[PDB]
Amino acid sequence: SAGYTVLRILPLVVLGVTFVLGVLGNGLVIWVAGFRMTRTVTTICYLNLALADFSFTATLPFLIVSMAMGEKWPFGWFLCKLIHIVVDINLFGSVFLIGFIALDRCICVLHPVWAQNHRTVSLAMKVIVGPWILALVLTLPVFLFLTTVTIPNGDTYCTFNFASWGGTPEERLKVAITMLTARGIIRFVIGFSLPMSIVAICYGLIAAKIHKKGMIKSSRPLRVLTAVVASFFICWFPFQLVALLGTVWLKEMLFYGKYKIIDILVNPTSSLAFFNSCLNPMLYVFVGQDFRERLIHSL
Amino acid sequence: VQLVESGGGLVQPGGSRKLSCSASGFAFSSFGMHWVRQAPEKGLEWVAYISSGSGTIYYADTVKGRFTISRDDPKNTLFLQMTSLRSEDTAMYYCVRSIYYYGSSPFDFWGQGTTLTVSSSDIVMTQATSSVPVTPGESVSISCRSSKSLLHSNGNTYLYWFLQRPGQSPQLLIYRMSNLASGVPERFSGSGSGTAFTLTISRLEAEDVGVYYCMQHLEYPLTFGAGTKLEL
Amino acid sequence: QKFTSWFX
Amino acid sequence: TASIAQARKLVEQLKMEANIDRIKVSKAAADLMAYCEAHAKEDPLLTPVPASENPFR
Amino acid sequence: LSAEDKAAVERSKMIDRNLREDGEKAAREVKLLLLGAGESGKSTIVKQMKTGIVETHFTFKDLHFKMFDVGAQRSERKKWIHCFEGVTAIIFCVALSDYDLVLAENRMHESMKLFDSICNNKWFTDTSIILFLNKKDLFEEKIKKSPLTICYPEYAGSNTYEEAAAYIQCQFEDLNKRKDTKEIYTHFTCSTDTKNVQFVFDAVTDVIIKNNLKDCGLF
Amino acid sequence: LDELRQEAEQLKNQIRDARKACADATLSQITNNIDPVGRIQMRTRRTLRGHLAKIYAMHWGTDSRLLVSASQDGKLIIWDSYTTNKVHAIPLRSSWVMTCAYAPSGNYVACGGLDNICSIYNLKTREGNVRVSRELAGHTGYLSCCRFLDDNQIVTSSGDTTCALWDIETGQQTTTFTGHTGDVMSLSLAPDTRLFVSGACDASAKLWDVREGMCRQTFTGHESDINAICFFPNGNAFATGSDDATCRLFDLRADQELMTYSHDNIICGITSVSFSKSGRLLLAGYDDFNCNVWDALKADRAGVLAGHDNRVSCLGVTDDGMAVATGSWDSFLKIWN
Ligand SMILES: CCCCCCCCCCCCCCCC(=O)O
Ligand SMILES: CCCCCCCCCCCCCCCC(=O)O
């Protein structure tokens, strides 16, 4: 157990760094890109990504004490349900709006005339709820089934229950393997595989166009391009692989165990997945010179 | 600027009718429109109101549910769908335009009206004297009293005066208790304190005879007075 | 029947 | 000559620029000092106005 | 609060809907500032795109254009050149046949004096310039009977059309003291060309892409 | 021959010796005994939003509640400053406006700019829309300022170096003022509507007579183009504003400069100049995105207004002195008190 002490507290130090950098990194974006800059389609997409990360980062003190206690939940039933609703929505809202910023930036560069003619601030606010409605639809597993459970020792943990839906206790577990495989598939396919296929394609089609047309006169195009597609990869792919391998082997771990590495790595890889929320102001909003000019004249 | 209404006639009770008010000669889309009825040998009372762009629609408590107002801005027509007509709905229905900004003169133009025959709380405005004997040349003073103080907190006193000549539509004389409308002479003057008001005419002419109607615009429903008739 | 709920 | 037309109307203008009556600046400065002293109480920017007399609360 | 006041807010809330709607129709229009020293081919260009400021509206490949001709009124440029700060591109036309002609006091030298006052202006530090070098069909008159040494005594070069016209293009692009913020697009015109509105379309599409990339931080 | 040229130079020597003969004591010397104004702290009471481009001019009404504003989006918005309500939104036939005027009766608004046309609009029509009353055409240069004398008389400035008094009903200019050398940039009518001053780009402000059409006085203190001008409420003085980073007060009776309002930290041009109701505070817009208020009798900076993110293009104090409106290139029109 010599090195496992690091693997236990290394999620805690990363979730604390992204808390003190999240509410300051995203709260700066809600301040000047929401109230001190004029409304643009680009600023609306940066604002909704900031609210998707700021409201998630406000729930990190509740998660950092649940992770420290070893999944023991000291809070109530209402804070168990509300925070995991707010975490899931705003994590799905963080990923789906990263893919919306990319489709915007690709239509703007690949088809420039359609953006001048059809892309506007009024159309931006009506299509921006698309990532948010898809978050509330996909978070309905949590509303319905995340309930505080008490084990006999008296510890309260926040997990799911399906005995109220199955009725019979042996075939209530048939429902339990059913939706947890349905949760793990929509986490990877809709939650990872779809916006990674949007980010890698659209930021690759942008670099295919600007290199062909010779718009590179510095290294600043290709480095911000490769920062976005790599930060969306190296933060989310350690988490979405150990959650997919978990879904592939759910029966083997629950019914018979035998796969410890999957469980030991969830707290480590989820902390790297939550570190993307403090990187999204620095990679999407802080890069532009127009935003940095408005921050120094507002402080 | 003219408003000619159509759709009146003799309706059996319990029936339905659609009054239409066709506007011409002004910006119909910028004006909020009202319907004001006038029962035979009775005073005016407000029916419905639709705003510019159909965003605010108000009805009287007598006609709520039964009557439906609507407007068509590309066609410059104003509609009042009437359903389940009672015996108290026999009236001459007027089409009134009203624009609302700072310094505006609402209720400025009234339509000529259509006669509907059906073949069978609120600020009370007590225009006390019903008839005044007068002869041309001297001054007259028409008094009006309200159940509530019409002086709002912004400094405005929402009293509106109207004059209905015999056989004619009502016309605006004084809007907001001290401002004479465009087209009326300087003989008419208005003063008031918030609950009691007066309309003074300096030198009376044969043009100035008719029934003088008091009106409030502090809150909906807009209620009228019973009428003060001037005879000569 | 113990599945520590994974966030996502 | 087009130059003599620009010259003569400029000279004729500068004559009426010269023959105007001029008072001392010490009288001209004291009159602006007198106007500002008389209308000082009626200035809502020189002194702050109470919020009851202010329409811009 | 009052009935009349509520309808006044409803009038104002119907006005800012119309101001927001008219502001979207203006953002779809590409604004272009058309300049040029004298009659250097401004009249031939506006026929190709087909008492004060004169605006010309034209569409090409689903893109609305607004072209402002401000050479019709003569005053100090310094007091109204800040009205065109947010223009998409400046169309500066120079007649290539104006290297031999002298005005009353050299006519290509006054085009270079008008160019560096516009290219190096503080209001146009990031605005692209589409430089139309008009009247190349006066090859047949001018450059054979009179060399380019009349206006450029520094130049010996060659008296062919292609290398003399490339020297005039280079002498207009060397006045650009801002090489990293703005770009000069140069096209030659003979007043019998149908492809002049296409070169403006390819220039603005580069500017629209570059302006979109500066908003997203990629530039 | 050329003796008319040299006669003009000793005529300028006679004027300069007449100005120096009256210069006994400066305005800074007289006002050493008067009390200094405390640091004026005006806060933003109302921000008027709705413009989508650079606001170029505003003008208050005589009711001190309604103000019109001109912007490059092609819109002329009449605001209710008490409740931030938009009374009217007038589309313009050319979006290149540079000035706007509100009639003293409230019936009319004017605008003009790079179209060289002063368009008078009718606000009090029997129809509910604002119509174009007249279009004053003949001015051959960009129209820099316009100010209403009456409902039928409007004076304009243009960049054709001339000012012109117009008759609105006939649509013809009745009096042309052709004394200036450079482009005339600003107007200011006197309170008795008999005289007006006009600053131009030849660093000279001229006092004009409306009835006669003659240049009464000429003031030559500045170093560059006078962008702003404003009469004192007395009518015997006016202040200018230039790209010298210098405002200065002239007197029509002493016929010379009285006081210079300049600070060494300011190196930017003045775009707009307005006076208070007493004339004690001289307010000046700047290209440093601020509006500095100046105690107009002591030449010290009494305060600053700093709520704008771009160049303060226009500035106006109400007739009752309650508010100061500040418009700027960031599409905002701020009310200060
Ligand atoms: C399950 C699908 C995954 C892949 C999704 C790909 C999304 C489309 C990416 C390209 C969008 C832009 C297409 C070209 C637009 C144009 O230039 O007209
Ligand atoms: C296929 C699943 C993912 C879909 C993601 C969104 C796809 C958007 C498709 C349209 C993109 C291009 C829009 C402009 C097209 C044009 O006008 O040329």
Side-chain angles (χ1 to χ4, degrees), chain A residues 176-190:
Chain A
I177 314 295
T178 298
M179 71 88 59
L180 266 72
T181 49
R183 178 177 172 86
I185 282 301
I186 66 171
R187 184 170 24 201
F188 184 77
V189 173
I190 302 169

PDB file of all heavy atoms in Angstrom, chain A residues 176-190:
ATOM      1  N   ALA A 176     -31.121  -3.594 -13.244  1.00  0.00           N
ATOM      2  CA  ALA A 176     -29.931  -2.877 -12.790  1.00  0.00           C
ATOM      3  C   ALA A 176     -28.791  -2.985 -13.794  1.00  0.00           C
ATOM      4  O   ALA A 176     -28.082  -2.005 -14.052  1.00  0.00           O
ATOM      5  CB  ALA A 176     -29.491  -3.409 -11.428  1.00  0.00           C
ATOM      6  N   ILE A 177     -28.598  -4.169 -14.376  1.00  0.00           N
ATOM      7  CA  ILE A 177     -27.574  -4.324 -15.405  1.00  0.00           C
ATOM      8  C   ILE A 177     -28.040  -3.684 -16.710  1.00  0.00           C
ATOM      9  O   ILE A 177     -27.225  -3.302 -17.560  1.00  0.00           O
ATOM     10  CB  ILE A 177     -27.225  -5.815 -15.579  1.00  0.00           C
ATOM     11  CG1 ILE A 177     -27.021  -6.473 -14.215  1.00  0.00           C
ATOM     12  CG2 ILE A 177     -25.954  -6.012 -16.391  1.00  0.00           C
ATOM     13  CD1 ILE A 177     -25.835  -5.934 -13.433  1.00  0.00           C
ATOM     14  N   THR A 178     -29.356  -3.524 -16.872  1.00  0.00           N
ATOM     15  CA  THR A 178     -29.903  -3.027 -18.131  1.00  0.00           C
ATOM     16  C   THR A 178     -29.592  -1.550 -18.341  1.00  0.00           C
ATOM     17  O   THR A 178     -29.036  -1.167 -19.377  1.00  0.00           O
ATOM     18  CB  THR A 178     -31.412  -3.266 -18.180  1.00  0.00           C
ATOM     19  OG1 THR A 178     -31.675  -4.673 -18.125  1.00  0.00           O
ATOM     20  CG2 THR A 178     -32.001  -2.697 -19.461  1.00  0.00           C
ATOM     21  N   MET A 179     -29.928  -0.700 -17.368  1.00  0.00           N
ATOM     22  CA  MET A 179     -29.768   0.731 -17.611  1.00  0.00           C
ATOM     23  C   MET A 179     -28.336   1.187 -17.356  1.00  0.00           C
ATOM     24  O   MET A 179     -27.904   2.205 -17.910  1.00  0.00           O
ATOM     25  CB  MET A 179     -30.776   1.541 -16.790  1.00  0.00           C
ATOM     26  CG  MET A 179     -30.574   1.627 -15.289  1.00  0.00           C
ATOM     27  SD  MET A 179     -29.505   2.997 -14.794  1.00  0.00           S
ATOM     28  CE  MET A 179     -30.418   4.375 -15.457  1.00  0.00           C
ATOM     29  N   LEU A 180     -27.594   0.478 -16.497  1.00  0.00           N
ATOM     30  CA  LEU A 180     -26.187   0.822 -16.289  1.00  0.00           C
ATOM     31  C   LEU A 180     -25.350   0.518 -17.526  1.00  0.00           C
ATOM     32  O   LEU A 180     -24.303   1.138 -17.743  1.00  0.00           O
ATOM     33  CB  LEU A 180     -25.621   0.099 -15.066  1.00  0.00           C
ATOM     34  CG  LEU A 180     -25.637   0.826 -13.717  1.00  0.00           C
ATOM     35  CD1 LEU A 180     -27.019   0.946 -13.110  1.00  0.00           C
ATOM     36  CD2 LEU A 180     -24.688   0.143 -12.747  1.00  0.00           C
ATOM     37  N   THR A 181     -25.786  -0.436 -18.348  1.00  0.00           N
ATOM     38  CA  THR A 181     -25.181  -0.569 -19.667  1.00  0.00           C
ATOM     39  C   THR A 181     -25.732   0.478 -20.623  1.00  0.00           C
ATOM     40  O   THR A 181     -25.036   0.904 -21.550  1.00  0.00           O
ATOM     41  CB  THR A 181     -25.397  -1.975 -20.220  1.00  0.00           C
ATOM     42  OG1 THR A 181     -26.776  -2.337 -20.090  1.00  0.00           O
ATOM     43  CG2 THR A 181     -24.524  -2.977 -19.486  1.00  0.00           C
ATOM     44  N   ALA A 182     -26.973   0.916 -20.408  1.00  0.00           N
ATOM     45  CA  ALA A 182     -27.522   2.000 -21.215  1.00  0.00           C
ATOM     46  C   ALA A 182     -26.911   3.336 -20.818  1.00  0.00           C
ATOM     47  O   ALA A 182     -26.836   4.262 -21.632  1.00  0.00           O
ATOM     48  CB  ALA A 182     -29.044   2.039 -21.084  1.00  0.00           C
ATOM     49  N   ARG A 183     -26.397   3.437 -19.604  1.00  0.00           N
ATOM     50  CA  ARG A 183     -25.787   4.702 -19.150  1.00  0.00           C
ATOM     51  C   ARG A 183     -24.371   4.720 -19.693  1.00  0.00           C
ATOM     52  O   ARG A 183     -23.927   5.786 -20.142  1.00  0.00           O
ATOM     53  CB  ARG A 183     -25.822   4.845 -17.629  1.00  0.00           C
ATOM     54  CG  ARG A 183     -25.179   6.104 -17.070  1.00  0.00           C
ATOM     55  CD  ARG A 183     -25.346   6.144 -15.564  1.00  0.00           C
ATOM     56  NE  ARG A 183     -24.602   7.213 -14.920  1.00  0.00           N
ATOM     57  CZ  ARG A 183     -25.042   8.456 -14.774  1.00  0.00           C
ATOM     58  NH1 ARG A 183     -26.231   8.797 -15.237  1.00  0.00           N
ATOM     59  NH2 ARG A 183     -24.290   9.354 -14.167  1.00  0.00           N
ATOM     60  N   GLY A 184     -23.706   3.582 -19.679  1.00  0.00           N
ATOM     61  CA  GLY A 184     -22.314   3.567 -20.101  1.00  0.00           C
ATOM     62  C   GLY A 184     -22.157   3.714 -21.601  1.00  0.00           C
ATOM     63  O   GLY A 184     -21.118   4.164 -22.088  1.00  0.00           O
ATOM     64  N   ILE A 185     -23.185   3.326 -22.356  1.00  0.00           N
ATOM     65  CA  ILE A 185     -23.134   3.468 -23.806  1.00  0.00           C
ATOM     66  C   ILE A 185     -23.353   4.922 -24.209  1.00  0.00           C
ATOM     67  O   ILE A 185     -22.614   5.466 -25.036  1.00  0.00           O
ATOM     68  CB  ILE A 185     -24.146   2.513 -24.469  1.00  0.00           C
ATOM     69  CG1 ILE A 185     -23.593   1.086 -24.481  1.00  0.00           C
ATOM     70  CG2 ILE A 185     -24.497   2.951 -25.886  1.00  0.00           C
ATOM     71  CD1 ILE A 185     -22.282   0.943 -25.215  1.00  0.00           C
ATOM     72  N   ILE A 186     -24.332   5.594 -23.592  1.00  0.00           N
ATOM     73  CA  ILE A 186     -24.590   6.992 -23.933  1.00  0.00           C
ATOM     74  C   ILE A 186     -23.509   7.901 -23.357  1.00  0.00           C
ATOM     75  O   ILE A 186     -23.367   9.055 -23.776  1.00  0.00           O
ATOM     76  CB  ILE A 186     -25.992   7.424 -23.465  1.00  0.00           C
ATOM     77  CG1 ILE A 186     -26.084   7.420 -21.940  1.00  0.00           C
ATOM     78  CG2 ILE A 186     -27.053   6.534 -24.079  1.00  0.00           C
ATOM     79  CD1 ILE A 186     -27.351   8.045 -21.407  1.00  0.00           C
ATOM     80  N   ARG A 187     -22.691   7.381 -22.456  1.00  0.00           N
ATOM     81  CA  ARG A 187     -21.590   8.206 -21.910  1.00  0.00           C
ATOM     82  C   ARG A 187     -20.492   8.202 -22.943  1.00  0.00           C
ATOM     83  O   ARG A 187     -19.862   9.247 -23.137  1.00  0.00           O
ATOM     84  CB  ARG A 187     -21.031   7.769 -20.554  1.00  0.00           C
ATOM     85  CG  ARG A 187     -19.965   8.674 -19.963  1.00  0.00           C
ATOM     86  CD  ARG A 187     -19.709   8.249 -18.535  1.00  0.00           C
ATOM     87  NE  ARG A 187     -20.085   6.859 -18.346  1.00  0.00           N
ATOM     88  CZ  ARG A 187     -20.357   6.315 -17.170  1.00  0.00           C
ATOM     89  NH1 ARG A 187     -20.305   7.052 -16.076  1.00  0.00           N
ATOM     90  NH2 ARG A 187     -20.693   5.042 -17.088  1.00  0.00           N
ATOM     91  N   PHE A 188     -20.283   7.079 -23.595  1.00  0.00           N
ATOM     92  CA  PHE A 188     -19.181   6.996 -24.545  1.00  0.00           C
ATOM     93  C   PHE A 188     -19.602   7.464 -25.931  1.00  0.00           C
ATOM     94  O   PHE A 188     -18.905   8.268 -26.555  1.00  0.00           O
ATOM     95  CB  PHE A 188     -18.642   5.568 -24.608  1.00  0.00           C
ATOM     96  CG  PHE A 188     -17.447   5.411 -25.499  1.00  0.00           C
ATOM     97  CD1 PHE A 188     -16.199   5.822 -25.077  1.00  0.00           C
ATOM     98  CD2 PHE A 188     -17.572   4.844 -26.754  1.00  0.00           C
ATOM     99  CE1 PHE A 188     -15.097   5.679 -25.890  1.00  0.00           C
ATOM    100  CE2 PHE A 188     -16.474   4.697 -27.572  1.00  0.00           C
ATOM    101  CZ  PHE A 188     -15.235   5.116 -27.138  1.00  0.00           C
ATOM    102  N   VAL A 189     -20.736   6.971 -26.427  1.00  0.00           N
ATOM    103  CA  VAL A 189     -21.176   7.244 -27.790  1.00  0.00           C
ATOM    104  C   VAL A 189     -21.632   8.690 -27.927  1.00  0.00           C
ATOM    105  O   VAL A 189     -21.145   9.425 -28.794  1.00  0.00           O
ATOM    106  CB  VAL A 189     -22.291   6.274 -28.215  1.00  0.00           C
ATOM    107  CG1 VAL A 189     -22.862   6.672 -29.562  1.00  0.00           C
ATOM    108  CG2 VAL A 189     -21.761   4.854 -28.261  1.00  0.00           C
ATOM    109  N   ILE A 190     -22.558   9.117 -27.072  1.00  0.00           N
ATOM    110  CA  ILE A 190     -23.066  10.480 -27.170  1.00  0.00           C
ATOM    111  C   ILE A 190     -22.182  11.440 -26.381  1.00  0.00           C
ATOM    112  O   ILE A 190     -21.942  12.574 -26.806  1.00  0.00           O
ATOM    113  CB  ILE A 190     -24.533  10.521 -26.704  1.00  0.00           C
ATOM    114  CG1 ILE A 190     -25.375   9.568 -27.548  1.00  0.00           C
ATOM    115  CG2 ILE A 190     -25.117  11.914 -26.834  1.00  0.00           C
ATOM    116  CD1 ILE A 190     -26.769   9.339 -27.007  1.00  0.00           C
TER     117      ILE A 190
END
